Design a protein around this ligand. Structure first.
Ligand SMILES: NC(=O)c1ccc[n+]([C@@H]2O[C@H](COP(=O)([O-])OP(=O)(O)OC[C@H]3O[C@@H](n4cnc5c(N)ncnc54)[C@H](O)[C@@H]3O)[C@@H](O)[C@H]2O)c1
Ligand SMILES: NC(=O)c1ccc[n+]([C@@H]2O[C@H](COP(=O)([O-])OP(=O)(O)OC[C@H]3O[C@@H](n4cnc5c(N)ncnc54)[C@H](O)[C@@H]3O)[C@@H](O)[C@H]2O)c1
Ligand SMILES: NC(=O)c1ccc[n+]([C@@H]2O[C@H](COP(=O)([O-])OP(=O)(O)OC[C@H]3O[C@@H](n4cnc5c(N)ncnc54)[C@H](O)[C@@H]3O)[C@@H](O)[C@H]2O)c1
Ligand SMILES: NC(=O)c1ccc[n+]([C@@H]2O[C@H](COP(=O)([O-])OP(=O)(O)OC[C@H]3O[C@@H](n4cnc5c(N)ncnc54)[C@H](O)[C@@H]3O)[C@@H](O)[C@H]2O)c1
Ligand code: NA
Ligand code: NA
Ligand code: NA
Ligand code: NA
Lengths: 260, 260, 260, 260
């Protein structure tokens, strides 16, 4: 019997086998959890159905986080199956491509800013509100994924740094709001990982190489390591932890300047 | 001859004599600066004309930061008078009243989130872009006002904490973008001060009293103290400082728990 | 088979059943670890022998961290039994009583400062160096215990805040030094817990009550929660994490001001 | 009449014209302050007498901060001339050369640790206590110099990172202790500057070059910029600021990864 035997988690953000959300699903399922999944649009439905089947789940629901009604409906549909949930994993972020490529001052337009914040930060708050009744029933938790571009300037990131800073403050405000219900709210700040987000981004290889040289462990992290940290934060072993941004970046954030 | 003799600053955010922006204007003008001002809507025009006259200025322009064209036009109009600017002070923030009163998870709706971030965070980026040519001409600086609800949960603040976290990351991304031009970008994180924002907010008195008990100096800060810190950050004496969030809160942020 | 089956850990800092180190021992042993223990002086030997027996261990060695030779000898003796170690837990701190009671400026004498730093911060570095060969053999990890008085002023703490800040920087420098060997180095920043340290300290009850009111979870943490977080950081599930200060304080650190 | 006309400051840490303390002295004197100086040992006396004369001062006293009696005596001697002081500047740090050159775990011995902390951190606390009566008389302030190796790993720094972390916590504890008297306590975290400390350190040039590439302003800071920031923090314009670590590093600390 695994650490999460008898427990239930909703996973939002699987896109491919490289997704952080996929690695999190694998780890939770490995420890005995039953899973449910959302997909962002109809074009992704069949792929997400396939991924869910890999984890023995047929609980798959549409959820475009741009749309209030879809968030509400995803949780209403989930509630037909589950009378309570042990956790909700938010592994969702987006900014228009143009905002991430070029000089910050020049390229950060209002709509680009709006979208980055709406999809990457507000959506976690909206999902927390929609999930609240199911979370209350089992004193379940919330988890999101952030990146240290929130706290220091990182390359090719621009307005996403603003949106992740917003998200991390959201983690804290949610933790204070929902803590009275026994609901913990945390984030993982992952080091860079090749996922669908990096596809066609020529500079990603160079950034990974630079990360590998700076990180104290002298290597890049994996979705398995992020997945295991997520497993921990979603488990009874993390019952004393809320409002926390846990860095899973092989120590990169702790270095100010590396030798060479 | 004052520290800012021959220098020029645009001040966005005067609403009343209690405004942080008013205290900043007073300090810059005291040290010899020539000033220009924006007003948010027609109802505020005559009041802002009056305030500007107090500082010997007739350079007063409309600028609703919700509107791209108005931001652009304010700087085009300013450029008819000034061929360069030594600094731009952004003292602008807003969230709908309902978002600041009640449980964070329950009250933080999408539009409330959007407005808080658009007006309180994005607007600084937009103003920086519009101001860039005038700032380049004199290697001028940018300054904004933030609050420590970005970093820790503060009462009656909710989504504004997310928006200020976004703003502070914006300070850093702007500093990296504009630093090559010699343009510094900083913020002051002010302790709580009674301004128009607190009018009719019953709990504000209690929060000020609590601040006064916790702060190492055992008193609340004033717009004169914030104004003098702004003067410093807008002056040649701060030429080595960029991307900085300077706390002017009588040390409040440094205390984890106070005796009694 | 537990998560730590076949693994070996040295635990320094058991004093009583209330000790943080005792809770950590319980959790590691629960998951299958074999344990070894140190004791600070002869008066504690029999008690530590008894505690070790509770965890099926007869590996008990003297180690007063004030004495270079004792640190070296403890690891030389351990190496007669173990050809490698999966982790070393440092749960050791001390400052003279007079330094923790009264006005910081008045009571912080040179010797009090020296002792606080020597025992609470330097000792972790010394133990890391002495443990290095055994840690290298299994790519084992290091863990220490810190308190958030390092980052913000906490009551009845004084020079211990300086010593914990030193310790946390030590975590980072150790992580960068030992990371090349695959050795991770982390800390837990625990919320306040009643242990032997609080015995006879009249104000401790009031501080716990205040913690309970501020913390988002509205309760105080336990050595079981700290123990489980330690288990995580000492396990393969934390392989992506080094140089990290993980807060296990029920979210206390995330709150700037609480309602009432 | 300068900003500091009629005000008095004690400067501890002048060694050569490159010293940070020398740049601070220049700025305070430029704005009308009367100055006093300490020297560490007899070999430095004549040089410090000469520097003091450059600022129109004959108030020069021995003060080896390793020795309790010398700290006390320096302030007793100063009090024969001054019935109150507006500020005390601590620009003193040291670690044995061997501790700063090589692998942190290998080279950080107990005595090296002890000295680094005693001279670089404890001495500020001791000087604050000795200065308290003179500071109380004018509600004067305290200022120290720190480096961001406290918060992130910086090269060729090792135990000094621990000692600066200790010092910065000391700033906070002092601010809480002395704030009731109206005494502010702050630090400047300076970017790297060539001073006597770098003489014969071959790698310093490379570290400066790396700093210059990363910093948002794309240049290194000077003692004039540090001096002007110190002037600010020692002036009435900073009356709202205590417990603060002000970064004067051309924005270096705000960057996580630079392009190339
Ligand atoms: N990969 C990294 O290096 C890295 C580092 C730190 C944090 N993160 C964060 O991890 C999370 C997962 O990203 P990933 O790297 O796994 O990439 P990914 O593309 O696999 O996952 C991103 C997910 O966001 C979903 N999404 C985007 N817009 C949406 C919408 N409107 N409605 C619903 N879902 C929507 C996508 O469909 C996709 O499933 C993101 O928040 C990302 O910022 C990634
Ligand atoms: N007063 C405090 O306790 C405190 C503490 C820290 C930071 N701040 C920040 O200081 C800044 C000034 O606030 P204040 O306290 O002086 O209150 P205020 O009401 O005097 O100033 C707020 C300004 O924002 C302007 N504004 C709002 N929406 C706008 C729009 N669409 N277009 C243009 N201008 C718009 C208002 O017109 C007003 O001039 C804000 O960013 C606020 O968050 C205030
Ligand atoms: N209890 C709390 O609220 C709390 C909160 C955060 C961190 N901490 C830290 O947790 C750690 C454990 O403390 P605890 O609360 O379990 O109390 P404790 O008294 O049970 O453990 C303290 C240990 O330090 C050991 N120690 C002291 N001087 C020593 C020396 N010279 N040589 C060897 N060992 C020595 C003591 O013998 C004892 O075993 C300490 O670092 C403490 O600062 C405690
Ligand atoms: N130069 C840098 O890059 C840099 C960066 C950040 C902070 N700092 C800090 O600035 C401060 C000044 O250093 P600097 O770079 O001007 O070098 P410096 O050598 O000019 O000044 C160091 C001072 O410390 C004094 N000192 C050392 N041991 C002493 C003792 N026992 N008693 C009395 N005085 C003693 C020295 O005599 C000297 O006056 C130090 O705290 C240093 O850590 C320097
Ligand atoms: Na960019
Ligand atoms: Na609230
Ligand atoms: Na005290
Ligand atoms: Na080193």
């Amino acid at each position: 019997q695994g650490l999460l035997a008898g427990k239930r988690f909703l996973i939002a953000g699987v896109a491919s086998k490289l997704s952080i959300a996929y690695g999190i699903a694998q780890a939770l399922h490995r420890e005995g959890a039953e899973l449910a999944f959302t997909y962002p649009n109809e074009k992704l439905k069949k792929r997400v159905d396939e991924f869910a089947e890999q984890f023995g789940s047929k609980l798959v629901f549409p959820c475009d986080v741009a749309v209030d009604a879809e968030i509400d409906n995803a949780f209403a549909e989930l509630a037909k199956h589950w009378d309570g949930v042990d956790g909700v994993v938010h592994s969702i972020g987006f900014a228009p491509a143009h905002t991430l490529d070029g000089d910050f001052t020049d390229v950060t337009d209002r709509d680009g800013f709006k979208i980055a914040h709406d999809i990457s930060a507000y959506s976690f708050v909206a999902m927390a509100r929609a999930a609240k009744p199911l979370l209350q029933a089992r004193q379940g938790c919330l988890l999101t994924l952030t990146y240290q571009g929130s706290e220091r300037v990182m390359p090719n990131y621009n307005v996403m740094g603003m949106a992740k800073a917003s998200l991390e403050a959201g983690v804290r405000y949610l933790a204070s709001s929902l803590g009275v219900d026994g609901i913990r709210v945390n984030a993982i700040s992952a080091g860079p990982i090749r996922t669908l987000a990096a596809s066609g981004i020529k500079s990603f290889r160079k950034m990974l190489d630079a990360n590998e040289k700076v990180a104290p462990l002298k290597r890049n992290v994996t979705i398995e390591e992020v997945g295991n940290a997520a497993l921990f934060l979603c488990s009874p072993w993390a019952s004393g932890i809320t409002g926390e941004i846990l860095y899973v970046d092989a120590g990169f954030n702790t270095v100010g300047m590396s030798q060479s």
